């Protein structure tokens, strides 16, 4: 469906086209256009590396879809599985959990740190 | 060195007939049309490539050392001096006559 | 557009010196060599020689060495160029039409030529 | 078998590409202070069984180097004094010397001073080439064509080597093969961290300093049947050229305005002689013997290859132009380029004029005034090559004539970057293997 | 052998030396300054594009990596016995410079299918 | 939440809990500022490339097969993990770093070729 | 071209060759009216139906 083609698609149908959005994240004074475009390119590289570091900190490095041990708090969203993956889109869902994103990110970081510690102790003995 | 050999100085061809003036040469060859003492005009640049603004009838083909300068649907205006040039060397051109 | 305007016809005595001029305008003159050709009446073209517009260096055959002289003058404002050909020791063989041709590429594919200055001794 | 795709990263493969190389080298115009300090041990890896299709005449390294040298020249000339008040009427008397002709003019002129409302009266020994008449009234040659700025005083023009290193993800392939003409497949290829020591030496008709070939004299032309293409000759043995300006010169500071200084040739403390360059006679004769041998290789064994002095042009092209100790020499090489070769401690002194107003890189509108250099100056350089042009219209009648070349200054860089190519690594590769997840 | 030393060596011989090529892929006040900055940004972007291409196929952080995509014979009709002994990587790139895009797309689709299957398997 | 570099003076046992805090702050963000940002990005990529070359990609705490040479440090596990901070230990293995890095590179190389031999039976 | 300084020129009108006329612009009348008609029809949506 091309770049951002599954925007109006449901969450489940848009989870099959994560690659087409992943590729377009990195596809791209002496003069008026020089320094500002170079700054934009450096900012794009920094944003991509921040996203990759965030993925690696949660243990989901190199994975487009990755599972985690963090339980889903009912306060974050009371909606069930069917009305999330067959009714709503990704835009609406991001608008819904826009407050709760930071708490979820912190829980993912804490869970991965705990998992790494448990794995290290288990491998030690 | 440069060796040049051209077709005989005068060929007579009627309107609607196709004539080929062969020129055997070593080097990049260009075809020019000189019209009655006026300055030459570049018909063909390199072996087979057409100058911009030249009529589409004009064409050439290179095989071995010979360049034929195929002209399709000859007309009364095209009747003029034609010659082949490689670098600084120019043969005395042929002359279509009608 | 691209244009190379020549001068009028000249008549000179034998042993005198003739100058033919060629004002080039309408393009980046400094990038393309300006060759000089000499058509005798009824015979084929001859190669008087080329001149670089950037450095002024000419190149002429052994036949024209010592007599011909190709100079170039870039008029201020960089609006036009003037390429001059001077013949010094004229004789009966120099009755001819002189053309100034722009060598576009390494094929020596002269696409623009001058009007042609006819000189007769 | 039913093999599957296997992905390899770090594959040693490359493709042709153009990128911006950065300078590394171990004050002057070519700012090496803002360059990478080069590593002491160059990494040269001989790539065996690799043949690479080199083409020196379409090298982008040469174009990038030319652009960089021009930009560095402009950058060095920018942040210091511009000599705009000098273009006025100059009443120029002849110099005191009892006599080449009028090679030095005395030229007294009213000039500006620190106070705008006041005018002084100074003088400055200009050269004949730097002044054109307008019986005694003169003016600087640059006045009706260009805006002149002073070459910047503490800054030196002495070349020092600069290495053109490719960035990460790119490699430089050197062609170690000897007797290697510019185009075609080089079979002996090496990968290097950076180029050799390349001194930017501006010169016409004679490539000074630089590299010195390996085995034999090498003639390289973009097309040897084309007159418009220059012929670069590289020697296997250098020819020592000893150049000198013998006049002892005095530099006077003049105040043209607040904080601006103009340096003038106040006096000649000594004797007025003509500058020159000596070339050894026997060495140059043997060198030209090697050159005519390698040219007869190209043009057949029965051609009367003769050399002749340059046909007309600007002064930068008709004479061997260069810079020695800050003073710009223009040497009449009519004695060098002579003789007529047939199919078989004495020195040649070339009288060099000297100029102060200079138009570099084939430009007008940006004129440069080299300040006078105090004391006598001497240089010892290596002629390691030539630029030549062949007279056209041979009509297969032998007797090919070769005159010295022009001031393109990209041919000067092509005699150093002929062996180098820039390639881009493409580490991702896909192959078939019985590998399967 | 140094950087790019195994360019002439056989493919199997260069499989063990991939690391040195992999390492050497990262490394206006002045004319050198802004140009060096642009060159560094270009090198960083190229390296990250290569790493992203590796990671989208499931080969993240590995020089050698199997994939589930079958080697379709239309891309090359050749025998594995003599590719790894009597061929060099440059020639191999020259043969298959023309089908890289579709192969990369197939790798993307196959890894997306594999990740979906792993998600479904871990669901139950 | 001790914060950035908060566990720098605590022993390693409490310092290894806060690896993410110092890892996050390596990517927080004229010509000089652009050069600084590019250098920071290149340094982060150098560190991550070093991690990926040892097989520790995307792993803050990574176990490896390299044996610990006794010549590098004669101390014991309890003394290392419960008496000194990370700064003192870094001062204590300053000259042995490159050898350990090379051994990790060689060990991961051996691991990947062994894995390829095993999977392609 | 008037040389004002070294390497600097000032391009200045020298002479009008021919009759001195006035610059102008022509717009079709039959087009510009009913173009204004469409504009008025679309403005009356915002500003009311009986407005002048
Ligand atoms: C080809 O390379 C040759 C060397 O292989 C070049 O010859 C050398 O060139 C320099 C040119 O000046 C000369 O070496 C010294 O010159 C200085 C004068 O410059 C210094 O002083 C001024 C102010 O006093 C300062 O601004 C400069 O930065 C320098 O520090 C004198 O101090 C010395 O007497 C000495 O002569 C040599 O003549 C020469 N060196 C040799 C023969 O060893 C040659 O110029 C190059 N060819 C070119 C560029 O065409
Ligand atoms: C210089 O320009 C000349 C043309 O003026 C180029 O010469 C061309 O060279 C090629 C390669 O040798 C010739 O083609 C080959 O030779 C024969 C036919 O002569 C035949 O076996 C093949 O067709 C083959 O391509 C070509 O004929 C010749 N002429 C032209 C007009 O293209 C030359 O390559 C240029 N370069 C140099 C570095 O000399
Ligand atoms: C290349 O070499 C030739 C021959 O050596 C040089 O030609 C010579 O040029 C000078 C300077 O223009 C001529 O002198 C002039 O001659 C007449 C008197 O005969 C007079 O008008 C001038 O006062 C001046 O002295 C000289 O005659 C001439 N020689 C010959 C044999 O023609 C030429 O200058 C050199 N070109 C270069 C280095 O570019
Ligand atoms: C150039 O001319 C000036 C005068 O215009 C000369 O300077 C004078 O030289 C005489 C004779 O030695 C002294 O008496 C004067 O005091 C000098 N200075 C003046 C008038 O300011 C100068 O010597 C000449 N320079 C040369 C020929 O190199
Ligand atoms: C060039 O001229 C200068 C003066 O303009 C000479 O420098 C003088 O040298 C003598 C002898 O050593 C000293 O006593 C003077 O004090 C110097 N004068 C100045 C003003 O510095 C210099 O020696 C001359 N050079 C040559 C090669 O003759
Ligand atoms: C370059 O040098 C040659 C050789 O010295 C000069 O040719 C001489 O010119 C003078 C007049 O300037 C004549 O009197 C000589 O007879 C010439 N010598 C010959 C023909 O061998 C030539 O003029 C110089 N070029 C310049 C100064 O531009
Ligand atoms: C250029 O100047 C050299 C010195 O800088 C000259 O070298 C000479 O060579 C011998 C020793 O080899 C001695 O005679 C003398 O002391 C001097 O060093 C060289 O000949 C000279 N070259 C030319 C062409 O004039
Ligand atoms: C848009 O939504 C409708 C249902 O409202 C669905 O049938 C259709 O396929 C969707 N179109 C997309 C995702 O392009
Ligand atoms: C934040 O959550 C509240 C309810 O707790 C909700 O009303 C609000 O819409 C959320 N914010 C956004 C930006 O959607
Ligand atoms: C400047 O004047 C000199 C004086 O001789 C002349 O040669 C030159 O052509 C002039 N330059 C121009 C008009 O650009
Ligand atoms: C001054 O000018 C020239 C300079 O070459 C010289 O030949 C001439 O004799 C001098 N003129 C005089 C003293 O009148
Ligand atoms: C300086 O200006 C004066 C007038 O004040 C004039 O007579 C003279 O010729 C000018 N030049 C010099 C060099 O004195
Ligand atoms: C020199 O170049 C010519 C063509 O320009 C070619 O025939 C010749 O083989 C080249 N030299 C080599 C490969 O050594
Ligand atoms: C030196 O040149 C002379 C003629 O000028 C000739 O006799 C001699 O052979 C030349 N030397 C060489 C090495 O060619
Ligand atoms: C060049 O050589 C000729 C003889 O061939 C000689 O007469 C002439 O003087 C020489 N020119 C010089 C040395 O400038
Ligand atoms: C000339 O070349 C020689 C080697 O042939 C070298 O030692 C010397 O430094 C070079 N430079 C000179 C004499 O300036
Ligand atoms: C290719 O070079 C490698 C070393 O780089 C060597 O092992 C191999 O034998 C060479 N090829 C041939 C055919 O000798
Ligand atoms: C693809 O590229 C190759 C190599 O350049 C070319 O020869 C071929 O015609 C192209 N097409 C196919 C279908 O292989
Ligand atoms: C500092 O030292 C005390 C000593 O009792 C220890 O308890 C504490 O954990 C150390 N570190 C910090 C970060 O406070
Ligand atoms: C490493 O060795 C140097 C001497 O080369 C020594 O000064 C330094 O303290 C040592 N570092 C350690 C043991 O961490
Ligand atoms: C404008 O000029 C064009 C020709 O260029 C003409 O056809 C058209 O009718 C003119 N329009 C006017 C006068 O409104
Ligand atoms: C403009 O067109 C409208 C609508 O056709 C018409 O009512 C009106 O009279 C026209 N105005 C003129 C011709 O001035």
Handedness of CA D375, D381, D383, D386 (dihedral sign): negative
Tokens of F70: 């006794």
Resolution in A: 3.2
Q: Do E16 and F109 touch (CB under 8 A)?
A: yes
Among D residues 336-375, those touching chain C with beta carbons less than 8 Å apart: 362, 364
Radius of gyration of chain B (CA): 12
Q: Do A61 and E60 touch (CB under 8 A)?
A: yes
Nearest in space to C61 (alpha carbons), one of D227, D340, D288? D227
Handedness of CA A115, A117, A120, A124 (dihedral sign): negative
- Phi, psi dihedral angles at C77 (to 5 degrees): 80, -5
In the block, tokens 């003409």 appear at D181
Nearest CA in chain B to C107: B28
Among C residues 14-53, those touching chain B with beta carbons less than 8 Å apart: 37, 43-47
Tokens of F40: 């920071």
* CA distance linking residue A52 with residue A65, whole number of Å: 13
Asked whether the beta carbons of D419 and D212 are under 8 A apart, the reply is: no
Asked whether the beta carbons of A36 and A48 are under 8 A apart, the reply is: no
Tokens of E28: 């206006």
Tokens of A43: 């900012």
- Write the DSSP symbol of residue D198: B
| CB-neighbour burial class of residue F67 (10 A; exposed 0-12, middle 13-18, buried 19+) | exposed
* CA distance linking residue D61 with residue A79, whole number of Å: 63
| Nearest ligand to residue A91 Cα | 9
Which one of D205, D371, D380, D416 would you pick to mutate in the ligand 1 pocket, going by the greatest count of ligand atoms within 8 A of its CB?
D380
- Write the DSSP symbol of residue A8: S
> Regarding the domain with residue range B1-98, which homologous superfamily does it belong to in the CATH classification?
Immunoglobulins (2.60.40.10)
* CA distance linking residue E96 with residue E108, whole number of Å: 18
* CA distance linking residue D55 with residue D90, whole number of Å: 52
Quick one: how far is CA G33 from the chain centroid? 17
Query: A90 CA distance to ligand 8 centroid (A)?
Result: 14
- Write the DSSP symbol of residue C93: G
Q: Count other C-beta atoms under 10 Å from residue E43's C-beta.
A: 21
* CA distance linking residue A33 with residue D15, whole number of Å: 29
* CA distance linking residue D326 with residue B72, whole number of Å: 65
Query: E10 CA distance to ligand 17 centroid (A)?
Result: 7
Beta strands per DSSP E along E56-118: 64-70
* CA distance linking residue D7 with residue D203, whole number of Å: 52
| Nearest ligand to residue C66 Cα | 3
In the block, tokens 């009913």 appear at G34
Beta strands per DSSP E along D370-408: 377-390, 401-404
* CA distance linking residue D69 with residue D361, whole number of Å: 9
Handedness of CA D402, D403, D409, D415 (dihedral sign): positive
| Nearest ligand to residue E91 Cα | 18
Query: C75 CA distance to ligand 10 centroid (A)?
Result: 8
Q: Do G7 and D87 touch (CB under 8 A)?
A: no
Asked whether the beta carbons of D55 and D182 are under 8 A apart, the reply is: yes
* CA distance linking residue D106 with residue D102, whole number of Å: 10
* CA distance linking residue C92 with residue D267, whole number of Å: 56
Q: Do D43 and E3 touch (CB under 8 A)?
A: yes
Residues near D325 by beta carbon (within 8 Å), at least 6 away in sequence: D158, D245, D373, D377, D378, D379
Tokens of E103: 């192969």
Cα–Cα distance list, D193 to B77, D24, E20 (Å): 64, 11, 14
* CA distance linking residue E24 with residue C38, whole number of Å: 60
Which one of F86, F91, F94 would you pick to mutate in the ligand 20 pocket, going by the greatest count of ligand atoms within 8 A of its CB?
F94
Chains that touch D (3 or more CB pairs under 8 A): B, C, E, F, G
Residues near E110 by beta carbon (within 8 Å), at least 6 away in sequence: E67, E68, E69
Tokens of D432: 């078939």
Strands C34-39 and C45-51: antiparallel
Q: Which long-range contacts (CB under 8 A, 24 or more apart) does F96-102 make?
A: F96/F72, F100/F66, F100/F72, F101/F50, F101/F54
Q: Count other C-beta atoms under 10 Å from residue B20's C-beta.
A: 14
Determined by: cryo-EM
Nearest CA in chain F to D437: F119
Q: What is the CATH number of the domain that holds C2?
A: 2.60.40.10
Which one of D206, D241, D242, D244 would you pick to mutate in the ligand 7 pocket, going by the greatest count of ligand atoms within 8 A of its CB?
D242
CB-CB neighbors (< 8 A) of A22 in chain E? 52, 56
The CB of D183 under 6 Å from ligand 2? The reply is yes
Strands D36-37 and D377-390: unpaired
Tokens of C45: 């073209």
Q: Do A41 and E37 touch (CB under 8 A)?
A: no
Quote helix, strand, coil % in chain C, to nearest 5. 5, 50, 45
CB-CB neighbors (< 8 A) of F23 in chain A? 53, 57
Strand partners, D131: D140
Handedness of CA C56, C59, C65, C69 (dihedral sign): negative
- Write the DSSP symbol of residue G47: H
| CB-neighbour burial class of residue F66 (10 A; exposed 0-12, middle 13-18, buried 19+) | middle
Helix H or strand E encompassing E14: helix E11-15
CB-CB neighbors (< 8 A) of A62 in chain F? 57-58
Tokens of A5: 């083609």
Domain residue limits, chain B: 1-98
G3 interfacial to chain C (CB closer than 8 Å): yes
| Domain count along chain C | 1
Helix H or strand E encompassing D67: helix D60-77
Kindly report the protein residue whose alpha carbon is nearest to atom 2 of ligand 12. Answer: D110
Q: Count other C-beta atoms under 10 Å from residue D436's C-beta.
A: 15
* CA distance linking residue F1 with residue D166, whole number of Å: 46
Nearest in space to E110 (alpha carbons), one of E50, E76, E59? E59
- Phi, psi dihedral angles at D304 (to 5 degrees): -90, 85
DSSP per-residue letters across C18-47: EEEEEEEESS-GGGS-EEEEEE-SSS-EEE
Cα–Cα distance list, D363 to C71, D320, F113, G7 (Å): 18, 18, 60, 12
Chains that touch B (3 or more CB pairs under 8 A): C, D
């Amino acid at each position: 469906l091309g770049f951002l083609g599954a925007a109006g698609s449901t969450m489940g149908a848009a989870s099959m086209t994560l690659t087409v959005q992943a590729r377009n994240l990195l596809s791209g004074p002496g003069t008026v256009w020089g320094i500002k475009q170079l700054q934009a390119r450096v900012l794009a590289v920094e944003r991509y590396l921040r996203d990759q570091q965030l993925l690696g900190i949660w243990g989901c490095s190199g994975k487009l879809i990755c599972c985690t041990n963090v339980p889903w708090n009912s306060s974050w969203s009371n909606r069930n599985l069917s009305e999330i993956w067959d009714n709503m889109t990704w835009l609406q869902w991001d608008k819904e959990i826009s407050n709760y994103t930071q708490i979820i990110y912190g829980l993912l970081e804490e869970s991965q740190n705990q998992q790494e510690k448990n794995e290290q102790d288990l491998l030690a003995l | 060195d440069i060796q040049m050999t051209q077709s005989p100085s005068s060929l007579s061809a009627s309107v609607g007939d196709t004539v080929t003036i062969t020129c055997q040469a070593n080097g990049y060859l260009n075809w020019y049309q000189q019209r009655r003492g006026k300055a030459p005009k570049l018909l063909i640049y390199d072996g087979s490539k057409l100058e911009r603004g030249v009529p589409s009838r004009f064409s050439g083909r290179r095989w071995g050392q010979e360049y034929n300068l195929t002209i399709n649907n000859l007309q009364p205006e095209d009747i003029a001096t034609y010659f082949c040039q490689v670098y600084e060397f120019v043969v005395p051109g042929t002359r279509l006559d009608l | 557009q691209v244009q190379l305007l020549q001068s009028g016809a000249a008549v000179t005595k034998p042993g005198a010196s003739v100058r033919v001029s060629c004002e080039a305008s309408g393009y980046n003159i400094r990038d393309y060599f300006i060759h000089w050709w000499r058509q005798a009446p009824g015979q084929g073209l001859q190669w008087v020689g080329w001149i670089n517009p950037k450095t002024g260096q000419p190149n002429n055959p052994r036949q024209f060495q010592g007599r011909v002289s190709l100079t170039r003058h870039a008029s201020w404002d960089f609006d036009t160029y003037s390429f001059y050909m001077d013949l010094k020791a004229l004789r009966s063989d120099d009755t001819a039409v002189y053309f100034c041709a722009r060598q576009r590429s390494d094929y020596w594919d002269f696409d623009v030529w001058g009007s042609g200055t006819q000189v007769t001794v | 078998e039913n093999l599957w795709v296997t992905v390899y990263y770090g594959v040693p493969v490359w493709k042709d590409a153009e990128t911006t190389l950065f300078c590394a080298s171990d004050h002057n115009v070519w700012a090496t202070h803002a360059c990478v300090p080069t590593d002491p041990n160059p990494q040269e890896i001989h790539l065996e069984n690799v043949t690479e299709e080199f083409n020196m005449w379409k090298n982008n390294m040469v174009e990038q180097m030319h652009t960089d040298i021009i930009s560095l020249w402009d950058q060095s000339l920018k942040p210091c004094v511009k000599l705009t008040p000098l273009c006025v009427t100059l009443q120029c008397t002849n110099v005191t010397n009892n006599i080449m002709r009028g090679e030095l003019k005395n030229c007294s002129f009213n000039m500006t001073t620190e106070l705008r409302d006041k005018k002084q009266k100074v003088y400055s020994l200009f050269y004949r080439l730097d002044v054109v008449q307008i019986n005694k009234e003169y003016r600087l040659i640059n006045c009706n064509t260009s805006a002149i700025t002073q070459a910047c005083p503490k800054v030196s023009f002495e070349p020092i080597p600069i290495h053109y290193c490719a960035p990460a993800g790119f490699a430089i392939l050197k062609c170690k093969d000897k007797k290697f003409n510019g185009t075609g497949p080089c079979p002996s290829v090496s990968t290097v961290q950076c180029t050799h020591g390349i001194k930017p030496v501006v010169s016409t008709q004679l490539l000074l300093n630089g590299s010195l070939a390996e085995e034999e004299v090498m003639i390289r032309s973009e097309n040897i049947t084309n007159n418009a293409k220059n012929i670069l000759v590289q020697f296997n043995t250098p020819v020592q050229i000893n150049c000198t300006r013998p006049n002892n010169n005095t530099r006077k500071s003049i105040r043209i305005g607040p904080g601006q200084a103009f340096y003038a040739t106040g006096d000649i403390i000594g004797d007025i002689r003509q500058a020159h360059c000596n070339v050894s006679k026997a060495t140059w004769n043997e060198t030209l013997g090697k050159v005519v041998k390698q040219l007869r290789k190209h043009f057949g064994n029965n051609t009367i290859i003769r050399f002749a002095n340059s046909s007309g042009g600007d002064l930068e092209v008709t004479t061997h132009s260069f810079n020695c100790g800050g003073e710009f020499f223009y040497c009449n090489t009519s004695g060098l380029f002579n003789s007529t070769w047939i199919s078989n401690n004495d020195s040649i002194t070339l009288p060099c004029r000297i100029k102060q107003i200079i138009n570099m890189w084939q430009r007008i509108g940006q004129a440069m005034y080299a300040p006078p250099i105090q004391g006598v100056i001497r240089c010892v350089s290596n002629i390691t090559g030539l630029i030549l042009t062949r007279d056209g219209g041979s009509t297969n009648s032998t007797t090919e004539t070769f005159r010295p070349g022009g001031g393109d200054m990209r041919d000067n860089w092509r005699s150093e970057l002929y062996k180098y190519k820039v390639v881009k690594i493409e580490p991702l590769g896909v192959a078939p293997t019985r590998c399967k997840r």
